[PDB]
Amino acid sequence: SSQVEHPAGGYKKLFETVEELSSPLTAHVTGRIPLWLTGSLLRCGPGLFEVGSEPFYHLFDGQALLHKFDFKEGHVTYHRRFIRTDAYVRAMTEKRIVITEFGTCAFEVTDNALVNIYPVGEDYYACTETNFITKVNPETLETIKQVDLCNYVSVNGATAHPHIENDGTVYNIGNCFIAYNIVKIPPLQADKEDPISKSEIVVQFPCSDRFKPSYVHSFGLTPNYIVFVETPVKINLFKFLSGANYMDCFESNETMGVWLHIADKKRKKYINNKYRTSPFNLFHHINTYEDHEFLIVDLCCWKGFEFVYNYLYLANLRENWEEVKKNARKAPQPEVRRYVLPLNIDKADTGKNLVTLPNTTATAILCSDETIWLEPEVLFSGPRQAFEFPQINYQKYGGKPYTYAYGLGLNHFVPDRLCKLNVKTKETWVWQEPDSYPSEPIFVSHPDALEEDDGVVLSVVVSPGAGQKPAYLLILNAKDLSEVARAEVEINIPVTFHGLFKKS
Amino acid sequence: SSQVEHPAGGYKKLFETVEELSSPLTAHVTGRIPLWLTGSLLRCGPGLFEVGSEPFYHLFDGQALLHKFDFKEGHVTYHRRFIRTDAYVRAMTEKRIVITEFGTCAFPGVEVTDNALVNIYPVGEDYYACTETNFITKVNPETLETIKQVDLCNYVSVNGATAHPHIENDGTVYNIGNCFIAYNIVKIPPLQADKEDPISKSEIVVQFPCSDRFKPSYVHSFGLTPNYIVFVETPVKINLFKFGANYMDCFESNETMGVWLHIADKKRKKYINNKYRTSPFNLFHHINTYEDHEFLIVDLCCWKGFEFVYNYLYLANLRENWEEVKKNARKAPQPEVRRYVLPLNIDKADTGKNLVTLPNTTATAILCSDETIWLEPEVLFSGPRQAFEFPQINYQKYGGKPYTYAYGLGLNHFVPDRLCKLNVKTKETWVWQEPDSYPSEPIFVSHPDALEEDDGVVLSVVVSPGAGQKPAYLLILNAKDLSEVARAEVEINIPVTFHGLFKKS
Ligand SMILES: NCC[C@@H](O)c1ccc(F)c(OCC2CCCCC2)c1
Ligand SMILES: NCC[C@@H](O)c1ccc(F)c(OCC2CCCCC2)c1
Ligand SMILES: CCCCCCCCCCCCCCCC(=O)O
Ligand SMILES: CCCCCCCCCCCCCCCC(=O)O
Ligand SMILES: [Fe+2]
Ligand SMILES: [Fe+2]
Ligand code: NA
Ligand code: NA
C-alpha cells in the first residue's frame, strides 16, 4: 500500500500536454546504470490532451506519444515523437478533433495508438484496442504505416496485450460480429514476407449475450491452453451503431457475474467447462500456468460490475487530492486474485471442491447444472490501493510456474509507488518518494541470470516538486526494489501505460 | 498456518474414551501461573465414544464430559465429571445407545438428545451445559454435578437454540433457534430482585424470515452489537420431510441460493428488509460484529463451498493415519477468515455502485436493480486447509465493539495442532506450536489492570501423547505475542473439548 497523501496535486502533470523533441536529450545519471543494460525502453501514452480550444475528456483520448530511453555503457538519452496516426495527422491539418476518441466525440475508427508497442517479425507496432495498429521505427520513433487487421483476419479489434512466444509467434483476442476470436501471427519465415499476411483465427470463444460482447483488455496463455475471462462489462451494439463516443456504448450486466473460458491451444478447440464466479472488472492478467491438470490464473481484479473507466475522466483525475479520494469512495475495490481452473471434471465429485492442489485456498465447486463455481485465493488487497500494470520475468516465466510479479501502485487511481509481490508467500516490497508519480515497472533480466528476480525494473517517474527536475528514468534492483540509479531529464513527461525493453 | 506433519497419529487420543474423576487432581506447574488468575476454566467435550460394543460414529456424538481447571495463588487442579443427561443416564442403565445422537442412530414420540457436549454459559446465578437442541443441562460449576434438565420449549417457541448465546455485561442472554418456518431471537433477562428463574421470563424479541418455506438453514452462531442482531443464512439446509435416520441424514446443500445475510434492529425489535447476498460458504463461528459510521463490520470464520463441513468429522475419518487424513480433506471446503461490511443506509441513487465508503476496508456491497446488495469480503487470513477456527476475543470489553485482536485454534486438515492470534486491522499473525501437541479453543482472560485489548493470557487444554511427556496439560500463553507463561501437566489423557468459559472467583 501507499504511505503518502498528495495535497500539492503534482499528479496533474501526468495529464498536461508536452512538445515532442527533434533529437534525443542527455539524461543526468545519479548512481550507476548497469553496464549490461544495453537497449531501448519504448513506452506509449497520451501527449496532447487538447487540439487548440477543443479538449479531450478521457484518460485514453490524448494523442499517442512514443517515448524512448536508450541505455549504453552507463549513459542514458531520452527521446519522444507523436505517432503520425490518421487521428493526429488530420487533427494537425484541420486544427480540431476530427476522429472520435474513446471518451471524446468529434463534430471512422480511431488509430490513436497510445496504449502499448509490441514486436511482429522484425517490425514494432504501437497499438490501441481497435482494428488499426501503427508500424513505428524503434530507433528514430518515426511512424512507418497504418495496418488494418480487418484486411487479414475476421476481428473488429484486438487488445493492446498480445502474448509473444520465444520463437516470435504472436497471439491476441478480439470481438467478431457474436464471438471472441484468437488471432495467431506466425514468426518471420525464410521467405521474409510480412508475418501479418499469414495471420489466421486458431480458436473461437462463445459469448454470454448474443448481441452484447464483453470488453476484453487481456487474456491468459500457457504452452497448452488459452484462458479468456468474460466480465459483466458489456458493449451495447444497438447503441454502438447510432454525438456518441465509445464510453457511451458500455453497460454493466448485473446478474451474469464473471464467466471464465479455456481453449486447447495445440488442438485449436474450445473446452465446454462452465467456470463461474462473482462480478469484477479485469484489465490485466498477471500470469497463467499449468500445475497437475489445473490452470493457475493470477488476475488484477476490481470488485464490482460498474466500469472502472467511469472514474478515469481527466476532469476527475485533475481535481485536488481530497476530491480525488472522495470520487474513488464508491468505485470497485482493486484486489490481486488467484483462480484455479480444474481441467479434469468427474461427475462423481458433484457438490465438492475439485481444487486438490496442496498450496492454494482457491476452490472450484462442481454444481448439478455442471457450472463450476470458483472462489479466489487473494494475493494482495489494500483500501483503494491497486497493484496494477503487472509485469513478470515474461521471457523465461511467461505461461510457466513463477514466484514474482512487479506492479504500479494506484492510490485512489493516482500512481504513487512501485510494488513487488511474492505470489507464493504474499510478501510485498514498496518503493515510494513524496510527490513522485511512477509508470508501469518493466523487468530486465541480467543476461546470465539463473534466478527469477536477478535483474532490474525500469520506471518513468514524474517528480514536479519545486526542488527537483520534472521527470526521471528510475532503475530499482528487482530483488528488494532498492534504488540502483536515476536518469533525470529537464522536461515534463505525461502518463504512459505500457511498453517493452528492446535489447541491442 | 501449521509448520508440522503428524505421522505418529497422536491426534487419535482426542477421540479416545476416558474415565471421570471422583475428586480433583493436582497439575504439576512448570513456569509461573499468574497470581491474578483466580477462578475456573470450564470446558465441554465428548468423553465416551462407545457404550460397550456399540460405537458413536460422529465427532458430536460422544457423551458430554464437563472439565474444570481451578487456579488460585499459582496452583492448578484438574477435575472432570460426565454430565448426567437422559442420553448418558439411560445409556449406563440399559448398557447400550438409547438416544439417537447427531450422527449415530439408536435401535430398540421422537426422543431429542440432551447430550450437552458443546458449550457452557451463565443464566442469572446458574450455569448451563448445552448442545444445539431444546434441552440444556443446569450444572454445578464447583462440584461439576448435574442439577436439572431444562426444556426451552416450556418457555419460548423454538425447536432448538445454538451453543453460542451472546451475553451482555448486565447478564442479559441472546440466542437464535429454528421455529416450525422462521428463526427466532430469544432474550433471557438478568436476575431481578424477586430472584425467580430468568428462563421463566424468556421471550422472542424479533423473527428472521427463511429463504425456503419448508427447509431452514443450519445456524451455529449469530452476531450482536449494541443496536443490531446479524444472522447469516447459509446454503446448509435441514430437510424437514426427511426429518433408522439420524440428524446428519436430514442435512442437504442448496446449490443456487449462496449466502443470505440478515440484520434486525435490537432495541426497536424489528427485522430490516435489506437483501444482503454473497457466494456460498459454511459458517459455524462469528468472530465479532461492530458498528462503524452506519456500517456493520461482520468478521466470520468461513468454509468456501456449500458441502456440509460436518461430513468430514466422522470419528472413523479423524482416527485414520496422517496421509489418509490429508487426502480426505483435499475436496473439503477451504477455511478462510472474512470481513463483510453491511451498509445500513441504502440510497437508490447509488444503484450499480459500491456502497462501502469506509476508508480502511476492501470489502464491497453492490446495490443491484432488483434491490439485492451483493457483498464481497476482505480476506483477513487464508491458509491451505489451515483453518483459524474456534475464535475468541476480549469479549467482556470488545464484544459487539470496534476491536483489533482475535485468538483461534489452528486446524491442519481438521486436526487441531496450533494456537493463533490475528490482528484484524494489519492481518499480522502469531503462532504457538510444538510437535505432537493438539490444543483446544484458546479462552482470553484480561489482566485486572489491563489498559490495552490484549493485556492478559489465553488458556488452552493441550493433548501431548508423546512417549517422553505427560498425556495432557493446561497451557497459558501471553496474549501479547503468544509466548508461553506456564503449563499445568496432568497424568491422565483428556479428549477433544469444543467450547467453555473462565469463571472468575
Ligand atoms: N486502453 C484503454 C482503452 C482504449 O485503449 C480504447 C480506445 C479506443 C477504443 F475504441 C477502445 O475500445 C475498444 C473497442 C474497439 C471496437 C471493438 C470493441 C472494443 C478502447
Ligand atoms: N455443535 C455440533 C452439532 C451438535 O452440537 C448437534 C447435536 C445434536 C443435534 F441435534 C444437532 O442438530 C441441531 C438441530 C436440533 C433440532 C432443530 C434443528 C437443529 C447438533
Ligand atoms: C499510470 C496510469 C494512472 C492513471 C489511472 C490508471 C487507472 C488504471 C485502471 C486499471 C487498468 C486499466 C487499463 C489501463 C492501461 C491500458 O489502457 O492498457
Ligand atoms: C478441537 C476440535 C478438533 C476436531 C475437529 C474440529 C473441526 C471443526 C470444524 C469447524 C467448527 C465446527 C463447530 C465445532 C464446535 C462446536 O460444535 O461448536
Ligand atoms: Fe493494459
Ligand atoms: Fe461452536
Ligand atoms: Na521512503
Ligand atoms: Na515451535
PDB file of N, CA and C in Angstrom, chain B residues 23-96:
ATOM      1  N   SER B  23     -12.567 -36.933  42.602  1.00  0.00           N
ATOM      2  CA  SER B  23     -12.146 -35.617  43.154  1.00  0.00           C
ATOM      3  C   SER B  23     -11.020 -35.025  42.304  1.00  0.00           C
ATOM      4  N   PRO B  24     -10.759 -33.699  42.389  1.00  0.00           N
ATOM      5  CA  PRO B  24      -9.732 -33.058  41.561  1.00  0.00           C
ATOM      6  C   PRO B  24      -8.310 -33.601  41.774  1.00  0.00           C
ATOM      7  N   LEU B  25      -7.514 -33.645  40.699  1.00  0.00           N
ATOM      8  CA  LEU B  25      -6.060 -33.968  40.715  1.00  0.00           C
ATOM      9  C   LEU B  25      -5.256 -32.670  40.810  1.00  0.00           C
ATOM     10  N   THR B  26      -4.043 -32.745  41.360  1.00  0.00           N
ATOM     11  CA  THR B  26      -3.009 -31.680  41.282  1.00  0.00           C
ATOM     12  C   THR B  26      -2.377 -31.718  39.887  1.00  0.00           C
ATOM     13  N   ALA B  27      -2.181 -30.546  39.276  1.00  0.00           N
ATOM     14  CA  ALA B  27      -1.493 -30.370  37.979  1.00  0.00           C
ATOM     15  C   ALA B  27      -0.100 -29.786  38.238  1.00  0.00           C
ATOM     16  N   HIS B  28       0.951 -30.526  37.858  1.00  0.00           N
ATOM     17  CA  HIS B  28       2.377 -30.140  38.037  1.00  0.00           C
ATOM     18  C   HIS B  28       2.669 -28.898  37.192  1.00  0.00           C
ATOM     19  N   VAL B  29       2.930 -27.768  37.856  1.00  0.00           N
ATOM     20  CA  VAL B  29       3.190 -26.448  37.209  1.00  0.00           C
ATOM     21  C   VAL B  29       4.668 -26.355  36.809  1.00  0.00           C
ATOM     22  N   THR B  30       4.933 -25.989  35.552  1.00  0.00           N
ATOM     23  CA  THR B  30       6.249 -25.505  35.056  1.00  0.00           C
ATOM     24  C   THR B  30       6.054 -24.088  34.504  1.00  0.00           C
ATOM     25  N   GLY B  31       6.950 -23.161  34.852  1.00  0.00           N
ATOM     26  CA  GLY B  31       6.771 -21.715  34.634  1.00  0.00           C
ATOM     27  C   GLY B  31       6.005 -21.093  35.787  1.00  0.00           C
ATOM     28  N   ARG B  32       5.331 -19.966  35.545  1.00  0.00           N
ATOM     29  CA  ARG B  32       4.621 -19.180  36.587  1.00  0.00           C
ATOM     30  C   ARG B  32       3.157 -18.976  36.178  1.00  0.00           C
ATOM     31  N   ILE B  33       2.231 -19.633  36.884  1.00  0.00           N
ATOM     32  CA  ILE B  33       0.764 -19.372  36.786  1.00  0.00           C
ATOM     33  C   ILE B  33       0.521 -17.974  37.345  1.00  0.00           C
ATOM     34  N   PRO B  34      -0.023 -17.018  36.550  1.00  0.00           N
ATOM     35  CA  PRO B  34      -0.289 -15.668  37.050  1.00  0.00           C
ATOM     36  C   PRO B  34      -1.078 -15.676  38.368  1.00  0.00           C
ATOM     37  N   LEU B  35      -0.655 -14.862  39.340  1.00  0.00           N
ATOM     38  CA  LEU B  35      -1.238 -14.827  40.711  1.00  0.00           C
ATOM     39  C   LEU B  35      -2.585 -14.093  40.694  1.00  0.00           C
ATOM     40  N   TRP B  36      -2.847 -13.289  39.660  1.00  0.00           N
ATOM     41  CA  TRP B  36      -4.139 -12.575  39.457  1.00  0.00           C
ATOM     42  C   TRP B  36      -5.167 -13.508  38.802  1.00  0.00           C
ATOM     43  N   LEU B  37      -4.738 -14.676  38.312  1.00  0.00           N
ATOM     44  CA  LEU B  37      -5.622 -15.677  37.655  1.00  0.00           C
ATOM     45  C   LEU B  37      -6.291 -16.532  38.737  1.00  0.00           C
ATOM     46  N   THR B  38      -7.493 -16.134  39.163  1.00  0.00           N
ATOM     47  CA  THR B  38      -8.276 -16.780  40.249  1.00  0.00           C
ATOM     48  C   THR B  38      -9.664 -17.136  39.711  1.00  0.00           C
ATOM     49  N   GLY B  39      -9.949 -18.434  39.560  1.00  0.00           N
ATOM     50  CA  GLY B  39     -11.240 -18.931  39.050  1.00  0.00           C
ATOM     51  C   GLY B  39     -11.118 -20.299  38.403  1.00  0.00           C
ATOM     52  N   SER B  40     -12.086 -20.636  37.547  1.00  0.00           N
ATOM     53  CA  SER B  40     -12.272 -21.977  36.935  1.00  0.00           C
ATOM     54  C   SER B  40     -12.397 -21.851  35.415  1.00  0.00           C
ATOM     55  N   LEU B  41     -11.541 -22.554  34.670  1.00  0.00           N
ATOM     56  CA  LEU B  41     -11.738 -22.819  33.222  1.00  0.00           C
ATOM     57  C   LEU B  41     -12.675 -24.024  33.095  1.00  0.00           C
ATOM     58  N   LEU B  42     -13.941 -23.777  32.744  1.00  0.00           N
ATOM     59  CA  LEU B  42     -14.965 -24.825  32.488  1.00  0.00           C
ATOM     60  C   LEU B  42     -15.056 -25.057  30.976  1.00  0.00           C
ATOM     61  N   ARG B  43     -14.934 -26.313  30.533  1.00  0.00           N
ATOM     62  CA  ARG B  43     -14.952 -26.703  29.096  1.00  0.00           C
ATOM     63  C   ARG B  43     -15.762 -27.990  28.927  1.00  0.00           C
ATOM     64  N   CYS B  44     -16.465 -28.114  27.798  1.00  0.00           N
ATOM     65  CA  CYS B  44     -17.318 -29.277  27.441  1.00  0.00           C
ATOM     66  C   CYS B  44     -16.746 -29.976  26.205  1.00  0.00           C
ATOM     67  N   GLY B  45     -16.891 -31.301  26.154  1.00  0.00           N
ATOM     68  CA  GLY B  45     -16.488 -32.146  25.017  1.00  0.00           C
ATOM     69  C   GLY B  45     -17.017 -33.569  25.172  1.00  0.00           C
ATOM     70  N   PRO B  46     -16.910 -34.412  24.120  1.00  0.00           N
ATOM     71  CA  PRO B  46     -17.237 -35.832  24.238  1.00  0.00           C
ATOM     72  C   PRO B  46     -16.169 -36.541  25.081  1.00  0.00           C
ATOM     73  N   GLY B  47     -16.586 -37.458  25.959  1.00  0.00           N
ATOM     74  CA  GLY B  47     -15.695 -38.234  26.846  1.00  0.00           C
ATOM     75  C   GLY B  47     -15.852 -39.737  26.671  1.00  0.00           C
ATOM     76  N   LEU B  48     -17.013 -40.189  26.185  1.00  0.00           N
ATOM     77  CA  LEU B  48     -17.360 -41.622  25.991  1.00  0.00           C
ATOM     78  C   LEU B  48     -17.795 -41.828  24.535  1.00  0.00           C
ATOM     79  N   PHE B  49     -16.966 -42.507  23.736  1.00  0.00           N
ATOM     80  CA  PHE B  49     -17.113 -42.619  22.260  1.00  0.00           C
ATOM     81  C   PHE B  49     -17.699 -43.981  21.876  1.00  0.00           C
ATOM     82  N   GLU B  50     -18.064 -44.800  22.868  1.00  0.00           N
ATOM     83  CA  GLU B  50     -18.789 -46.083  22.670  1.00  0.00           C
ATOM     84  C   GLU B  50     -19.474 -46.489  23.980  1.00  0.00           C
ATOM     85  N   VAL B  51     -20.633 -47.143  23.874  1.00  0.00           N
ATOM     86  CA  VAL B  51     -21.361 -47.785  25.009  1.00  0.00           C
ATOM     87  C   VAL B  51     -21.203 -49.301  24.849  1.00  0.00           C
ATOM     88  N   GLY B  52     -20.195 -49.874  25.513  1.00  0.00           N
ATOM     89  CA  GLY B  52     -19.790 -51.283  25.357  1.00  0.00           C
ATOM     90  C   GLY B  52     -19.224 -51.540  23.971  1.00  0.00           C
ATOM     91  N   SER B  53     -19.944 -52.316  23.154  1.00  0.00           N
ATOM     92  CA  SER B  53     -19.544 -52.719  21.780  1.00  0.00           C
ATOM     93  C   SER B  53     -20.235 -51.836  20.732  1.00  0.00           C
ATOM     94  N   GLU B  54     -21.187 -50.988  21.144  1.00  0.00           N
ATOM     95  CA  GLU B  54     -21.917 -50.048  20.250  1.00  0.00           C
ATOM     96  C   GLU B  54     -21.111 -48.758  20.121  1.00  0.00           C
ATOM     97  N   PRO B  55     -20.591 -48.433  18.914  1.00  0.00           N
ATOM     98  CA  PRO B  55     -19.800 -47.220  18.715  1.00  0.00           C
ATOM     99  C   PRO B  55     -20.656 -45.984  18.398  1.00  0.00           C
ATOM    100  N   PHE B  56     -20.191 -44.807  18.823  1.00  0.00           N
ATOM    101  CA  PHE B  56     -20.621 -43.487  18.294  1.00  0.00           C
ATOM    102  C   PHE B  56     -19.786 -43.198  17.042  1.00  0.00           C
ATOM    103  N   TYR B  57     -20.413 -42.676  15.983  1.00  0.00           N
ATOM    104  CA  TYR B  57     -19.809 -42.546  14.630  1.00  0.00           C
ATOM    105  C   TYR B  57     -19.246 -41.136  14.394  1.00  0.00           C
ATOM    106  N   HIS B  58     -19.904 -40.089  14.906  1.00  0.00           N
ATOM    107  CA  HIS B  58     -19.575 -38.669  14.597  1.00  0.00           C
ATOM    108  C   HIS B  58     -18.876 -37.992  15.781  1.00  0.00           C
ATOM    109  N   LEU B  59     -18.091 -36.951  15.487  1.00  0.00           N
ATOM    110  CA  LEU B  59     -17.334 -36.128  16.471  1.00  0.00           C
ATOM    111  C   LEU B  59     -18.282 -35.549  17.531  1.00  0.00           C
ATOM    112  N   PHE B  60     -19.544 -35.282  17.172  1.00  0.00           N
ATOM    113  CA  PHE B  60     -20.540 -34.585  18.030  1.00  0.00           C
ATOM    114  C   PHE B  60     -21.510 -35.584  18.678  1.00  0.00           C
ATOM    115  N   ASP B  61     -21.109 -36.855  18.812  1.00  0.00           N
ATOM    116  CA  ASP B  61     -21.960 -37.966  19.319  1.00  0.00           C
ATOM    117  C   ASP B  61     -21.533 -38.375  20.733  1.00  0.00           C
ATOM    118  N   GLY B  62     -20.224 -38.399  21.010  1.00  0.00           N
ATOM    119  CA  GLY B  62     -19.658 -38.792  22.317  1.00  0.00           C
ATOM    120  C   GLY B  62     -20.345 -38.091  23.481  1.00  0.00           C
ATOM    121  N   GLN B  63     -20.461 -38.773  24.624  1.00  0.00           N
ATOM    122  CA  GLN B  63     -21.282 -38.319  25.777  1.00  0.00           C
ATOM    123  C   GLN B  63     -20.575 -37.166  26.497  1.00  0.00           C
ATOM    124  N   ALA B  64     -21.336 -36.111  26.803  1.00  0.00           N
ATOM    125  CA  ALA B  64     -20.869 -34.835  27.391  1.00  0.00           C
ATOM    126  C   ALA B  64     -19.991 -35.106  28.615  1.00  0.00           C
ATOM    127  N   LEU B  65     -18.792 -34.520  28.611  1.00  0.00           N
ATOM    128  CA  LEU B  65     -17.811 -34.537  29.727  1.00  0.00           C
ATOM    129  C   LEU B  65     -17.497 -33.083  30.103  1.00  0.00           C
ATOM    130  N   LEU B  66     -17.804 -32.689  31.343  1.00  0.00           N
ATOM    131  CA  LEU B  66     -17.565 -31.325  31.883  1.00  0.00           C
ATOM    132  C   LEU B  66     -16.199 -31.307  32.572  1.00  0.00           C
ATOM    133  N   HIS B  67     -15.269 -30.492  32.059  1.00  0.00           N
ATOM    134  CA  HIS B  67     -13.874 -30.337  32.551  1.00  0.00           C
ATOM    135  C   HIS B  67     -13.758 -29.047  33.369  1.00  0.00           C
ATOM    136  N   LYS B  68     -12.852 -29.021  34.351  1.00  0.00           N
ATOM    137  CA  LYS B  68     -12.576 -27.820  35.183  1.00  0.00           C
ATOM    138  C   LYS B  68     -11.103 -27.793  35.596  1.00  0.00           C
ATOM    139  N   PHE B  69     -10.388 -26.738  35.199  1.00  0.00           N
ATOM    140  CA  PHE B  69      -9.078 -26.336  35.770  1.00  0.00           C
ATOM    141  C   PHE B  69      -9.319 -25.168  36.730  1.00  0.00           C
ATOM    142  N   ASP B  70      -9.005 -25.358  38.015  1.00  0.00           N
ATOM    143  CA  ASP B  70      -9.099 -24.308  39.064  1.00  0.00           C
ATOM    144  C   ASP B  70      -7.724 -23.664  39.233  1.00  0.00           C
ATOM    145  N   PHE B  71      -7.692 -22.332  39.316  1.00  0.00           N
ATOM    146  CA  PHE B  71      -6.473 -21.514  39.527  1.00  0.00           C
ATOM    147  C   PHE B  71      -6.634 -20.713  40.821  1.00  0.00           C
ATOM    148  N   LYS B  72      -5.611 -20.747  41.679  1.00  0.00           N
ATOM    149  CA  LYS B  72      -5.553 -19.976  42.948  1.00  0.00           C
ATOM    150  C   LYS B  72      -4.102 -19.941  43.442  1.00  0.00           C
ATOM    151  N   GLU B  73      -3.567 -18.737  43.668  1.00  0.00           N
ATOM    152  CA  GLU B  73      -2.235 -18.483  44.282  1.00  0.00           C
ATOM    153  C   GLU B  73      -1.157 -19.309  43.565  1.00  0.00           C
ATOM    154  N   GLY B  74      -1.262 -19.434  42.238  1.00  0.00           N
ATOM    155  CA  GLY B  74      -0.230 -20.033  41.370  1.00  0.00           C
ATOM    156  C   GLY B  74      -0.264 -21.554  41.313  1.00  0.00           C
ATOM    157  N   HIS B  75      -1.307 -22.173  41.882  1.00  0.00           N
ATOM    158  CA  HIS B  75      -1.528 -23.646  41.917  1.00  0.00           C
ATOM    159  C   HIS B  75      -2.717 -23.997  41.015  1.00  0.00           C
ATOM    160  N   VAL B  76      -2.722 -25.204  40.436  1.00  0.00           N
ATOM    161  CA  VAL B  76      -3.774 -25.663  39.479  1.00  0.00           C
ATOM    162  C   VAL B  76      -4.232 -27.073  39.868  1.00  0.00           C
ATOM    163  N   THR B  77      -5.548 -27.294  39.884  1.00  0.00           N
ATOM    164  CA  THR B  77      -6.183 -28.635  39.981  1.00  0.00           C
ATOM    165  C   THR B  77      -6.968 -28.903  38.695  1.00  0.00           C
ATOM    166  N   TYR B  78      -7.139 -30.181  38.348  1.00  0.00           N
ATOM    167  CA  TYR B  78      -7.963 -30.653  37.208  1.00  0.00           C
ATOM    168  C   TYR B  78      -9.027 -31.621  37.727  1.00  0.00           C
ATOM    169  N   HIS B  79     -10.268 -31.440  37.271  1.00  0.00           N
ATOM    170  CA  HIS B  79     -11.436 -32.292  37.615  1.00  0.00           C
ATOM    171  C   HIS B  79     -12.314 -32.455  36.372  1.00  0.00           C
ATOM    172  N   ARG B  80     -12.938 -33.621  36.215  1.00  0.00           N
ATOM    173  CA  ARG B  80     -13.915 -33.881  35.127  1.00  0.00           C
ATOM    174  C   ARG B  80     -14.983 -34.858  35.625  1.00  0.00           C
ATOM    175  N   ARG B  81     -16.235 -34.602  35.244  1.00  0.00           N
ATOM    176  CA  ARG B  81     -17.414 -35.461  35.511  1.00  0.00           C
ATOM    177  C   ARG B  81     -18.252 -35.526  34.235  1.00  0.00           C
ATOM    178  N   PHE B  82     -18.736 -36.715  33.874  1.00  0.00           N
ATOM    179  CA  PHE B  82     -19.752 -36.889  32.808  1.00  0.00           C
ATOM    180  C   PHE B  82     -21.029 -36.181  33.266  1.00  0.00           C
ATOM    181  N   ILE B  83     -21.684 -35.464  32.354  1.00  0.00           N
ATOM    182  CA  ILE B  83     -22.991 -34.795  32.616  1.00  0.00           C
ATOM    183  C   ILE B  83     -24.054 -35.898  32.648  1.00  0.00           C
ATOM    184  N   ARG B  84     -24.833 -35.963  33.733  1.00  0.00           N
ATOM    185  CA  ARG B  84     -25.927 -36.956  33.916  1.00  0.00           C
ATOM    186  C   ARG B  84     -27.138 -36.487  33.105  1.00  0.00           C
ATOM    187  N   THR B  85     -27.014 -36.546  31.779  1.00  0.00           N
ATOM    188  CA  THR B  85     -28.092 -36.268  30.799  1.00  0.00           C
ATOM    189  C   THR B  85     -28.980 -37.513  30.702  1.00  0.00           C
ATOM    190  N   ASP B  86     -30.185 -37.374  30.143  1.00  0.00           N
ATOM    191  CA  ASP B  86     -31.058 -38.521  29.777  1.00  0.00           C
ATOM    192  C   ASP B  86     -30.252 -39.491  28.902  1.00  0.00           C
ATOM    193  N   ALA B  87     -29.515 -38.967  27.916  1.00  0.00           N
ATOM    194  CA  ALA B  87     -28.682 -39.746  26.970  1.00  0.00           C
ATOM    195  C   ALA B  87     -27.678 -40.615  27.738  1.00  0.00           C
ATOM    196  N   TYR B  88     -26.946 -40.024  28.689  1.00  0.00           N
ATOM    197  CA  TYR B  88     -25.875 -40.703  29.465  1.00  0.00           C
ATOM    198  C   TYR B  88     -26.490 -41.683  30.474  1.00  0.00           C
ATOM    199  N   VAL B  89     -27.435 -41.203  31.288  1.00  0.00           N
ATOM    200  CA  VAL B  89     -28.098 -41.979  32.379  1.00  0.00           C
ATOM    201  C   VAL B  89     -28.718 -43.252  31.787  1.00  0.00           C
ATOM    202  N   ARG B  90     -29.492 -43.117  30.709  1.00  0.00           N
ATOM    203  CA  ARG B  90     -30.239 -44.235  30.072  1.00  0.00           C
ATOM    204  C   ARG B  90     -29.263 -45.187  29.371  1.00  0.00           C
ATOM    205  N   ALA B  91     -28.137 -44.670  28.869  1.00  0.00           N
ATOM    206  CA  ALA B  91     -27.064 -45.473  28.237  1.00  0.00           C
ATOM    207  C   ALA B  91     -26.404 -46.362  29.296  1.00  0.00           C
ATOM    208  N   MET B  92     -26.119 -45.808  30.481  1.00  0.00           N
ATOM    209  CA  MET B  92     -25.482 -46.536  31.612  1.00  0.00           C
ATOM    210  C   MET B  92     -26.467 -47.571  32.175  1.00  0.00           C
ATOM    211  N   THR B  93     -27.760 -47.230  32.227  1.00  0.00           N
ATOM    212  CA  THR B  93     -28.866 -48.091  32.729  1.00  0.00           C
ATOM    213  C   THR B  93     -29.028 -49.320  31.824  1.00  0.00           C
ATOM    214  N   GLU B  94     -29.217 -49.105  30.516  1.00  0.00           N
ATOM    215  CA  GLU B  94     -29.563 -50.167  29.532  1.00  0.00           C
ATOM    216  C   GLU B  94     -28.298 -50.758  28.894  1.00  0.00           C
ATOM    217  N   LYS B  95     -27.116 -50.204  29.197  1.00  0.00           N
ATOM    218  CA  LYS B  95     -25.791 -50.675  28.699  1.00  0.00           C
ATOM    219  C   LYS B  95     -25.792 -50.736  27.163  1.00  0.00           C
ATOM    220  N   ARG B  96     -26.389 -49.732  26.513  1.00  0.00           N
ATOM    221  CA  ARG B  96     -26.448 -49.588  25.033  1.00  0.00           C
ATOM    222  C   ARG B  96     -26.711 -48.116  24.687  1.00  0.00           C
TER     223      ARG B  96
END
